[PDB]
């Protein structure tokens with residue numbers, strides 16, 4: 001298991017434009033295209049992302065290309081953020097994956113309200129951190145995925161992704 005396999009489980013793979021859990025146009029392995037309700041706006045973003053006139057469908061290779069870029073972008077986002085970097089630096093590699101997972105799903109602005117969770121994670125108060133993380137819109141809207149991510153933070157193991 002690793003961040004790539006982990007996110008592949010959580011996001012799936014779809015080669016045609018679809019709507020994510022929030023109703024937003026998305027493609028590939030959870031690549032958000034736009035928050036606009038316009039499908040044309042979404043296709044435009046797709047073309048711009050891929051570098052060709054696609055009209056809504058990409059190849060697996062193209063999906064994986066965007067996926068690698070997105071994982072990269074999440075890591076870079078964490079490292080450039082003064083609040084996130086120290087917590088991330090403090091974690092072992094498994095829990096780092098859990099962190100990247102969160103940022104991939106909700107962005108830096110989504111993780112902004114997680115100050116107290118972040119403090120607990122840096123203190124390595126795993127059970128307390130896990131409880132705090134579940135007290136969120138994130139957990140309530142996507143409980144099964146949040147549960148997996150939280151278990152990863154709680155245990156520092158890949159147990160929640162085994163048999164998946």
Ligand SMILES: Fc1cc(F)c(F)c(F)c1F
Pocket residue numbers: 078084085087088089091098099100102103111114118121
């Ligand atoms: F973005 C992040 C989200 C988390 F839940 C973290 F623990 C973290 F270190 C981090 F950088």
Ligand SMILES: [Cl-]
Pocket residue numbers: 016017055056057
């Ligand atoms: Cl389409």
